Amino acid sequence: SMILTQFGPFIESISGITDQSNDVFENAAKAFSMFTRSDVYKALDEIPFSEDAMLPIPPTIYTKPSHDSYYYIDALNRVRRKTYQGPDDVYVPNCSIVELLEPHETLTSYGRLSEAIENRAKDGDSQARIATTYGRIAESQARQIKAPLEKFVLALLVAEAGGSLYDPVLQKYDEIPGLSHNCPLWCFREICRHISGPLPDRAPYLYLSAGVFWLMSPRMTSAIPPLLSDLVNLAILQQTAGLDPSLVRLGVQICLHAAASSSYAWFILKTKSIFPQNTLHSMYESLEGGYCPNLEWLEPRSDYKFMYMGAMPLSTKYARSAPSNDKKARELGEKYGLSSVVSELRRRTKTYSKHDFTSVRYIRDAMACTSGIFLVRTPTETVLQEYTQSPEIKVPIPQKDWTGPIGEIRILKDTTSSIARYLYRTWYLAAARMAAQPRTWDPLFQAIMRSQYVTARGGSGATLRESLYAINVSLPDFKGLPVKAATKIFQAAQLANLPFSHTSVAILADTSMGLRNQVQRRPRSIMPLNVPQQQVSAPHTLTADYINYHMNLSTTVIPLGVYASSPPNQSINIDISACDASITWDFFLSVIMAAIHEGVASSSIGKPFMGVPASIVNDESVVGVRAARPISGMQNMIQHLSKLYKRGFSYRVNDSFSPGNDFTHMTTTFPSGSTATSTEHTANNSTMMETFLTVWGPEHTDDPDVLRLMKSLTIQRNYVCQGDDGLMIIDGNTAGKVNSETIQKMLELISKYGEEFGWKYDIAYDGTAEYLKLYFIFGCRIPNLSRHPIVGKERANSSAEEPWPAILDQIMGIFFNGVHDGLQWQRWIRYSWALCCAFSRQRTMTGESVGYLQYPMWSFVYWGLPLVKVFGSDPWIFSWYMPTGDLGMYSWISLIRPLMTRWMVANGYVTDKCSPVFGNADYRKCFNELKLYQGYYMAQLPRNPKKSGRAAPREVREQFTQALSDYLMQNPELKSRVLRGRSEWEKYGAGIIHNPPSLFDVPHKWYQGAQEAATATREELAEMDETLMRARKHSYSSFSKLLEAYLLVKWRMCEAREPSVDLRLPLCAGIDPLNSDPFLKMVSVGPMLQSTRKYFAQTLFMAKTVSGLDVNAIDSALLRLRTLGADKKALTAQLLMVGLQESEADALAGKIMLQDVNTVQLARVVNLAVPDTWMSLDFDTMFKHHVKLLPKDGRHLNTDIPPRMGWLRAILRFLGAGMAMTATGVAVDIYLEDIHGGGRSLGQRFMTWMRQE
Amino acid sequence: SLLRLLICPWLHMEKLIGEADPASTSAEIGWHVPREQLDGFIPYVSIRAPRLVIEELMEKNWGQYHAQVIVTDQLVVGEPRRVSAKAVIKGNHLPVKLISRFACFTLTSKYEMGAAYNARLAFRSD
């Protein structure tokens, strides 16, 4: 009732009861900020509960031993944890945090560590080092949270207390329970009450950018923030997705038993497969009916084009023929004292036998009720756990089967009984016909690939420059430049003039460790490489890209899994545990380098690559004699890669969490971060499955059944793989489902294939399907809600965090994550309003003034927040499928514009100038009184702006830019082409575009992109603050030129479209008549049924469409020059900025004029883009078939388009599509009401907009 | 390929310093500590070279690198006072270019002459 007193008007401003004004939204933001933590928990203690939320909590969570017996010291002076239950037991325990703290100066009962511990640790006191490791890793574990958790809870309160919500589709209130039924809120405030106790403060910790502070009660445990995070996660996901209370009680029981354990995160990692194993992996024992999709993976087996054949009724022969799930699941439930929850899940999973919305909803609930923490541990523990592994090659290649070496590499005899002959043959032939194509010999392609490894968090530039210092070369330091020391562009810039034989030693330096965290998985560790070894690692990824695009051509999404899980078909989920610890030089890289050395060896005789010259080695390969034969540049690069992959890798290790533990060591794992990582892994998966299916199958079985199976199951028809995961497609025959026992014999044979030469196929045959962690049952997608947690944020470094203008953007990301999964929309959108207004005000500390930084709602409405009830309209009036920009802005404003004008003449703001859009009513007074314009223009202000700003010395930057351009060049023929194009441009194309995209702004653009990690603090932040203030005080005239050009267009809707799919089929989980709006859009519009990498790659007008400079700007500028007159030589000059060869560039610039482009092409002209929400739906259907001109009234002479400049047709389709779809209900077809000016004057206005950039 | 490195250069150093005195041809480089608790040094590498090499290897920046040295208390069975010290390097590793191509050094060696000290090295003159 307290929040009711401060939010009298606001809580029904956003529940569809009273009209949403701006002033109450800012009053709400005032009450949001002017607020504290005791008010949080007295609001929590205010509410009662209704005897289903309550559960007993054991007091054994709290009283805990000390961490003195938990860590120890390595012989090489490294702090290391002592294990207790397995080698996985290495994490943070929930123990003994009270006595490692000094209370804060101006606070009473909170604070931080005492510093003299860290004085002794910098002196080398062992217990002090153990103490500061434990304190800072608990700091890191509590660091993983975006915002104060209390404000998330208060957003729950202010959203939830509005009560029941009417549905305009179902004409009912909802039937979800309210506050008085959740175990997370009651148990959450119970934990906080008992931990704080009778002490005057209440919040057990406070989040802060400078770092978390703890409360000093003696019962405080260290792993209380992830428990509180899981509580607030389930607290949201009940009332925003309609979970039943029972499974939430199950999930919080798991979380409380986790916090009661020895260590929290270890139990979380070992517990993560209870909800899938007992619900998903045991579902549909004996069905009776339902409706499944009917798809067809078409005849081109790489098209990813699907024709949906329609619904299909089920039958009882489609029961679960997958094997049993009793033994291992009940052993897992017994092992961790959790037999009760497993018994309940295996009870209720049996009770469902109909493939409808209810069963798939229950599976969605089971997926959602797992935990969502981020597993945080010490970096030394990672790099001494997973980087200390070697594969189990039980049958290696015998030493008699290799030839005499050629340089460093022996060659396989082809009369070899080992399996690796087939791998040798594949990479041999692939290297041969890779070097046979002249597309590898484009020097522009050379420049692309040299620019390609300028990405992916380049590091170790320090170790590059001191290894380069060790190998005795002069060195430009480039004094007085801001970011550059931590940049890979400096790594490239230092070796822009250097011979290859003078740099071949410098590929032996070590490697930095970049860390990330994951949902329910061990923390991955990306690593870069320095630029010469990324440069010399090229033909490896050349042939890998050759395999993945030509030879096995498997893949680089959703109805892939819909086809795989479809009931007569059967899927097998195949992973590997720890791929990168398996690719070593023992069995793979020797054969890989031999085959890539010899496959090019026919085509390579005297060819040079960029940078590298030729050489010569000898051979024992003609073992009767010995000679020496010359070595080409491909073979030179392979000869240099040979010793690097043969040798092993050195990894520097330095953390911020343990005090000064630096070390390097040898590790034989292929790096996770490289250009050649994922493509090579896919190629190896495909080749091993090919060798399996070719020879190793019928060599090792008996019955005709499994061999008669696998004869018809080749990799070109049934196998897809991307790195970790692989997937079987088992085709259902005329008898329906394939017999299961053959498939189990086959999969234990695949497990044998894994164990016998250094693999471990995690094989999961379950009657369902996963692919890129996307779950599919009977052709129905499961939105996993664990892997998009609201509260958590991965911060593997203790580096201080960016201030307020971007946490709001991650709130927008939380909103879109909630959009892309099937969440209850009445209660998701209102909670999003609550969070959105909760992070509005800021309370700066600028000089001489207490400034308040206030966004209106209208910036968010520009960013795609669906309005509930505006200007006295009906509540819940349109959907969240609005394109987040001027398009969607236009869409919903033009849906309601006459009702707007009636609200305008109410509280009369009248001026006799009859506007074409609002008539007698004005707009300038009211829309500034409502500050529609203020938020609307504040939305386009750039956020978190860091700038160089220091006026660096220009000569040293100029020689830096020249060295960068020298790195950009290997052939001056490129320079000849682009300078010739510059001459052509300065003749013709210059002027009328005001901004040519070129290739020599690209050194300037590389510098500008390199200068965006200075994280400077004061001056540009103050400039952004005063920029917002002078944007706020400035009164505005009218809208954007795009939007004013759009507001002359009207439309007319009638005849809702015929249905696309059958509604009685569960398409996705969480969408139904109960979740009325997005399900009804899915039924009306239809799902996409494409990969969309292929479709949107068809959109990009350049063929290879990569340059390193956002090729969308290239194609958009080309089409702008196309529509704005501009004779052909100017178009060639714009393309000669890229400078292909000028002959085919002249040909492409001749082509672009007369060819009518796709509808999606002309979006980039007007800077339109398809928003992210639409690719679940099939959009191209309703573009090219339903939104149309020449309406059913007929022709109008205002609904006309001139014969030239028919590029408008695409944009009319876009705007009509937006207006047809942003409203709730069926995506009705939409017809053109007139445009008030004629197509000539309208397109002339667009010409006048594109006169500038 | 390894054994010629082990044996062959010291024959040439025998040819070159067959007559000069150890008081001008010997040299030593290693880790250093400034004061006595419970003047101090860790012998890392031993080099013997002519004087026309040592007088330029004097002034080179040996004092650049850092290691974490460990000092305990037990005697060596050898006749000088030597404790079996321990050390772990917390920086880079020392390049073999820095010595010479004109002189040869002992390849592998065991260092000798409490708690952890964490200091840096320098050159020991002759």
PDB file of N, CA and C in Angstrom, chain A residues 75-78 123 466 469-472 660-664, chain B residues 64-65 68 70 87-93 95 97 116 118:
ATOM      1  N   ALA A  75      54.416 -25.452  -5.380  1.00  0.00           N
ATOM      2  CA  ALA A  75      55.868 -25.477  -5.260  1.00  0.00           C
ATOM      3  C   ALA A  75      56.523 -24.325  -6.010  1.00  0.00           C
ATOM      4  N   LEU A  76      55.914 -23.870  -7.107  1.00  0.00           N
ATOM      5  CA  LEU A  76      56.400 -22.705  -7.837  1.00  0.00           C
ATOM      6  C   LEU A  76      55.744 -21.412  -7.382  1.00  0.00           C
ATOM      7  N   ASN A  77      55.296 -21.355  -6.121  1.00  0.00           N
ATOM      8  CA  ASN A  77      54.708 -20.174  -5.481  1.00  0.00           C
ATOM      9  C   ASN A  77      53.481 -19.679  -6.248  1.00  0.00           C
ATOM     10  N   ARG A  78      52.452 -20.514  -6.258  1.00  0.00           N
ATOM     11  CA  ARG A  78      51.153 -20.136  -6.790  1.00  0.00           C
ATOM     12  C   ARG A  78      50.096 -20.582  -5.800  1.00  0.00           C
ATOM     13  N   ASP A 123      53.973  -8.052   0.797  1.00  0.00           N
ATOM     14  CA  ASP A 123      55.190  -8.502   1.451  1.00  0.00           C
ATOM     15  C   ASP A 123      55.398 -10.002   1.314  1.00  0.00           C
ATOM     16  N   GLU A 466      58.463  -6.887 -27.034  1.00  0.00           N
ATOM     17  CA  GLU A 466      59.732  -7.213 -26.387  1.00  0.00           C
ATOM     18  C   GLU A 466      60.403  -8.448 -26.987  1.00  0.00           C
ATOM     19  N   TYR A 469      62.093  -6.683 -29.584  1.00  0.00           N
ATOM     20  CA  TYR A 469      63.258  -6.062 -28.966  1.00  0.00           C
ATOM     21  C   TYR A 469      64.384  -7.071 -28.775  1.00  0.00           C
ATOM     22  N   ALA A 470      64.030  -8.321 -28.468  1.00  0.00           N
ATOM     23  CA  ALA A 470      65.036  -9.355 -28.267  1.00  0.00           C
ATOM     24  C   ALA A 470      65.717  -9.748 -29.569  1.00  0.00           C
ATOM     25  N   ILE A 471      65.014  -9.672 -30.696  1.00  0.00           N
ATOM     26  CA  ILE A 471      65.595 -10.077 -31.971  1.00  0.00           C
ATOM     27  C   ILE A 471      66.248  -8.898 -32.702  1.00  0.00           C
ATOM     28  N   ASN A 472      66.498  -7.790 -31.993  1.00  0.00           N
ATOM     29  CA  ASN A 472      67.418  -6.713 -32.385  1.00  0.00           C
ATOM     30  C   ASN A 472      67.007  -6.022 -33.692  1.00  0.00           C
ATOM     31  N   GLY A 660      49.947 -11.139  -7.732  1.00  0.00           N
ATOM     32  CA  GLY A 660      51.196 -11.422  -8.406  1.00  0.00           C
ATOM     33  C   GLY A 660      51.495 -12.897  -8.579  1.00  0.00           C
ATOM     34  N   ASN A 661      50.727 -13.580  -9.420  1.00  0.00           N
ATOM     35  CA  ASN A 661      51.034 -14.946  -9.836  1.00  0.00           C
ATOM     36  C   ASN A 661      51.149 -14.930 -11.352  1.00  0.00           C
ATOM     37  N   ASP A 662      52.373 -14.778 -11.838  1.00  0.00           N
ATOM     38  CA  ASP A 662      52.649 -14.730 -13.263  1.00  0.00           C
ATOM     39  C   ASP A 662      53.517 -15.925 -13.618  1.00  0.00           C
ATOM     40  N   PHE A 663      53.183 -16.580 -14.724  1.00  0.00           N
ATOM     41  CA  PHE A 663      53.893 -17.764 -15.179  1.00  0.00           C
ATOM     42  C   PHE A 663      53.514 -18.038 -16.622  1.00  0.00           C
ATOM     43  N   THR A 664      54.431 -18.677 -17.338  1.00  0.00           N
ATOM     44  CA  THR A 664      54.176 -19.209 -18.666  1.00  0.00           C
ATOM     45  C   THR A 664      54.459 -20.701 -18.644  1.00  0.00           C
TER      46      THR A 664
ATOM     47  N   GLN B  64      67.798  -5.592 -15.519  1.00  0.00           N
ATOM     48  CA  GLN B  64      66.578  -5.318 -16.255  1.00  0.00           C
ATOM     49  C   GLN B  64      65.482  -6.284 -15.828  1.00  0.00           C
ATOM     50  N   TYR B  65      65.864  -7.498 -15.452  1.00  0.00           N
ATOM     51  CA  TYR B  65      64.905  -8.583 -15.324  1.00  0.00           C
ATOM     52  C   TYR B  65      64.648  -8.898 -13.856  1.00  0.00           C
ATOM     53  N   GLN B  68      61.571 -14.068  -8.540  1.00  0.00           N
ATOM     54  CA  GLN B  68      61.098 -14.211  -7.170  1.00  0.00           C
ATOM     55  C   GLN B  68      61.945 -15.294  -6.514  1.00  0.00           C
ATOM     56  N   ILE B  70      63.838 -17.446  -3.380  1.00  0.00           N
ATOM     57  CA  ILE B  70      63.426 -18.094  -2.137  1.00  0.00           C
ATOM     58  C   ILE B  70      64.681 -18.551  -1.404  1.00  0.00           C
ATOM     59  N   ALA B  87      64.219 -20.114  -6.853  1.00  0.00           N
ATOM     60  CA  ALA B  87      63.894 -18.884  -7.565  1.00  0.00           C
ATOM     61  C   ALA B  87      62.929 -19.191  -8.698  1.00  0.00           C
ATOM     62  N   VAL B  88      61.951 -18.303  -8.888  1.00  0.00           N
ATOM     63  CA  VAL B  88      60.984 -18.377  -9.979  1.00  0.00           C
ATOM     64  C   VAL B  88      60.927 -17.005 -10.638  1.00  0.00           C
ATOM     65  N   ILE B  89      61.063 -16.968 -11.959  1.00  0.00           N
ATOM     66  CA  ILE B  89      61.121 -15.705 -12.688  1.00  0.00           C
ATOM     67  C   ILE B  89      59.709 -15.194 -12.943  1.00  0.00           C
ATOM     68  N   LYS B  90      59.471 -13.931 -12.595  1.00  0.00           N
ATOM     69  CA  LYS B  90      58.190 -13.275 -12.806  1.00  0.00           C
ATOM     70  C   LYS B  90      58.241 -12.252 -13.938  1.00  0.00           C
ATOM     71  N   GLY B  91      59.106 -12.470 -14.924  1.00  0.00           N
ATOM     72  CA  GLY B  91      59.198 -11.563 -16.051  1.00  0.00           C
ATOM     73  C   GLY B  91      59.306 -12.287 -17.375  1.00  0.00           C
ATOM     74  N   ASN B  92      60.310 -11.939 -18.163  1.00  0.00           N
ATOM     75  CA  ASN B  92      60.625 -12.654 -19.385  1.00  0.00           C
ATOM     76  C   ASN B  92      61.817 -13.573 -19.134  1.00  0.00           C
ATOM     77  N   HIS B  93      62.382 -14.117 -20.200  1.00  0.00           N
ATOM     78  CA  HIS B  93      63.567 -14.948 -20.086  1.00  0.00           C
ATOM     79  C   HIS B  93      64.727 -14.300 -20.826  1.00  0.00           C
ATOM     80  N   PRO B  95      67.692 -13.501 -23.181  1.00  0.00           N
ATOM     81  CA  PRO B  95      68.092 -13.930 -24.522  1.00  0.00           C
ATOM     82  C   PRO B  95      69.571 -14.250 -24.622  1.00  0.00           C
ATOM     83  N   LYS B  97      71.305 -13.912 -27.251  1.00  0.00           N
ATOM     84  CA  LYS B  97      71.982 -12.917 -28.071  1.00  0.00           C
ATOM     85  C   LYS B  97      72.786 -11.955 -27.213  1.00  0.00           C
ATOM     86  N   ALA B 116      61.107 -15.476   1.253  1.00  0.00           N
ATOM     87  CA  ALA B 116      61.093 -14.957  -0.108  1.00  0.00           C
ATOM     88  C   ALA B 116      61.514 -13.495  -0.132  1.00  0.00           C
ATOM     89  N   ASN B 118      62.411 -11.537  -3.570  1.00  0.00           N
ATOM     90  CA  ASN B 118      61.876 -10.915  -4.792  1.00  0.00           C
ATOM     91  C   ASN B 118      62.678  -9.671  -5.198  1.00  0.00           C
TER      92      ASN B 118
END
